[PDB]
Amino acid sequence: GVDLGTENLYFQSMQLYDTVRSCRNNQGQLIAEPFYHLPSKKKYPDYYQQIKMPISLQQIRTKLKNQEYETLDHLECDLNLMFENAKRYNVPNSAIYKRVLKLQQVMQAKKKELARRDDIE
Ligand SMILES: [Cl-]
Numbered sequence: 425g426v427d428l429g430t431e432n433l434y435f436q437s438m439q440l441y442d443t444v445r446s447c448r449n450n451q452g453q454l455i456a457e458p459f460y461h462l463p464s465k466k467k468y469p470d471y472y473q474q475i476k477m478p479i480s481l482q483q484i485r486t487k488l489k490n491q492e493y494e495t496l497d498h499l500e501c502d503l504n505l506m507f508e509n510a511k512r513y514n515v516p517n518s519a520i521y522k523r524v525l526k527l528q529q530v531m532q533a534k535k536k537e538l539a540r541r542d543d544i545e
């Protein structure tokens with residue numbers, strides 16, 4: 425009525441991304457750092473034989489800038505893809521797997537809030 429829904433969605437998107445990227449633990453360290461960039465090519469070619477659709481916060485960031493995310497669900501799709509790769513490639517007891525579960529939970533809780541409100545916090 426006083427906004428275009430199309431525009432608010434990019435604001436919601438940028439908030440969801442920021443919440444992941446800047447997520448901190450109890451100490452105050454940044455849980456998402458290992459997801460800032462894809463693993464080296466070619467120092468872990470193992471990873472690329474195994475992970476068919478690699479994605480990290482680098483590529484997500486660029487997609488967001490270029491308004492590729494038409495809905496919050498698309499962004500959540502790519503963030504989930506990133507978490508599920510790390511969960512496929514690492515074992516349940518690794519620290520990084522456990523950091524993914526928390527991140528993913530924080531991510532999904534944030535997306536659910538944003539969609540409930542249909543507005544940024
Ligand atoms: Cl509208």
Ligand SMILES: [Cl-]
Pocket residue numbers: 457458
């Ligand atoms: Cl790290």
